[PDB]
Design a protein around this ligand. Structure first.
Ligand SMILES: Cc1cc2nc3c(=O)[nH]c(=O)nc-3n(C[C@H](O)[C@H](O)[C@H](O)COP(=O)(O)OP(=O)(O)OC[C@H]3O[C@@H](n4cnc5c(N)ncnc54)[C@H](O)[C@@H]3O)c2cc1C
Length: 449
């Protein structure tokens, strides 16, 4: 497949924000010709199932089919659309009423804003009328791993893509002990997925991290501690307050030394320690990056320059209500991709509809969030006992709401085992009231007493 020399809409990166923008552009302009350039070999696909539902499939071919059952048992593909949705890049200029093409296996390596042109890694050049940068993020590594040898590096997984799901799933069936470094939602999701697999055979899964509990940077202490206990009960050796000093090999085994003196022996490492946005194109492009939040600096309309927009993980945007931010979540990529697509077809609209976040630690435990969520912000938590419907599966102390406050106004919300109430949370954040009583506000989420 060969890119044309010119395309009206060029989308750089072939993930969630690009796919959503393509969909939005085609809705706004049913004859649009849209080219997605994607460095990966696969068509656009969603990432969340890679750490969740693909692990809970009992079909041993799931690795090949990439089809998963949602918690409620409905089956679907990780791909946003099948191959029949797309047209070829070479045919894109000619097909009547246009289409969406994906040039896979190609990376955009230079952006020339003045001449509305990009160059690919193979030396082809493509001129565009409107461009979206949707390049996503790259995993941080741990310095202790960077200092270790090549064997350690080759037995350390940075969990991002289909290839990683496949490689780690295989490892899971081969080794006796896997260690996850990182206490965030992704680390914790992998801990639960791996712990579930380990269970039949009682093999070992370790999760270690510097905080006092799982998701300690986002959740307050009570709930972070509650979450750690839940992960432990999934059959995981959880080691909080753990700072890695070094990692080496010995007797074929990986040896992890912690600052506090503890040592861990394991067969494979998964490092889930957060991300950096992929801003390589900003230097050739002369595009500003945000030194406070990372990412391309764009405005409330996701716009960087006259015919360049940025969406998804890579976009540091101005939120008129909540302030400048960069958000790295699936629904944000959907919302911002869609918005950029509308703005690329004349919309001129600001980011307004607040995107949400979720995480499931199996069919039985679910979190959703929206707005400014950071455990350093003042929080107020209101909780209750869970009913049988308060879990991710049935949706399609055991529950509660956490309010995140700034200038005594709710700027963020976390819902713990409370589903189908995101719109209420969104409306509370939108209205920016000073609430006399957050226990009264908790009643909007069916949390009483
Ligand atoms: C395992 C996993 C589980 C997750 N679970 C959740 C969840 O439960 N809930 C949630 O809210 N969020 C979740 N996320 C986060 C969510 O997937 C991301 O926020 C989302 O993928 C961001 O979309 P994006 O378009 O910005 O980037 P991506 O979807 O990452 O797409 C960027 C694509 O562009 C490619 N690319 C980069 N640079 C170039 C270039 N120069 N040329 C060509 N191609 C390029 C990249 O290789 C990549 O394929 C998860 C992420 C992972 C990895």
């Amino acid at each position: 497949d060969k890119a044309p020399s010119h395309v009206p809409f060029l989308l750089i990166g072939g993930g969630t924000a690009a796919f959503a923008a393509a969909r939005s552009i085609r809705a706004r302009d049913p004859g649009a010709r849209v080219l997605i350039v994607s460095e990966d070999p696969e068509l656009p696909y969603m990432r969340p199932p890679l750490s969740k539902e693909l692990w809970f499939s009992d079909d041993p071919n799931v690795t090949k089919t990439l089809r998963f059952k949602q918690w409620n048992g409905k089956e679907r593909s990780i791909y946003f659309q099948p191959p029949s949705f797309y047209v070829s890049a070479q045919d894109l200029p000619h097909i009547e009423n246009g289409g969406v093409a994906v040039l896979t296996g190609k990376k955009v390596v230079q952006l020339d804003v003045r001449d509305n042109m990009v160059k690919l890694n193979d030396g082809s050049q493509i001129t565009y009328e409107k461009c979206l940068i949707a390049t996503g993020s790259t995993p941080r590594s741990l310095s202790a791993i960077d200092r270790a040898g090549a064997e350690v590096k080759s037995r350390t997984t940075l969990f991002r893509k289909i290839g990683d799901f496949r490689s780690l799933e295989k490892i899971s069936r081969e080794v006796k002990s896997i260690t996850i470094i990182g206490g965030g939602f992704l680390g914790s999701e992998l801990a639960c997925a791996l712990g579930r697999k380990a269970r039949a055979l009682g093999t070992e899964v370790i999760q270690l991290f510097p905080e006092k509990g799982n998701m300690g940077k986002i959740l307050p202490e009570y709930l972070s501690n509650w979450t750690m206990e839940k992960v432990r009960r999934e059959g995981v050796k959880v080691m909080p307050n753990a700072i890695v000093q070094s990692v080496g090999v010995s007797s074929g085994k990986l040896l992890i030394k912690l600052k506090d003196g503890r040592k861990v022996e394991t067969d494979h490492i998964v490092a889930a320690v957060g991300l950096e946005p992929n801003v390589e194109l900003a230097k050739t492009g002369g595009l500003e990056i945000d030194s406070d939040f990372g990412g391309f600096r764009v405005n409330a309309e996701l716009q960087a320059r006259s015919n360049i927009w940025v969406a998804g993980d890579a976009a540091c945007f101005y939120d008129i209500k909540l302030g400048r931010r960069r958000v790295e979540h699936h629904d944000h990529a959907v919302v911002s991709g869609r918005l950029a697509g509308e703005n690329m077809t004349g919309a001129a609209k600001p980011y307004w509809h607040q995107s949400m976040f979720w995480s499931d630690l199996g069919p039985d435990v679910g979190y959703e969030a929206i707005g400014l969520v950071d455990s350093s912000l003042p929080t107020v938590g209101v909780f209750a006992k869970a009913t049988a419907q308060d879990n991710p599966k049935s949706a399609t102390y055991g529950k509660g709401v956490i309010f995140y406050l700034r200038d005594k106004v709710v700027v963020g919300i976390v819902l713990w085992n409370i589903f189908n109430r995101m719109p209420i949370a969104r409306k509370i954040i939108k209205d920016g009231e000073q609430h006399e009583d957050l226990n009264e506000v908790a009643k909007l989420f069916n949390i009483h007493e």
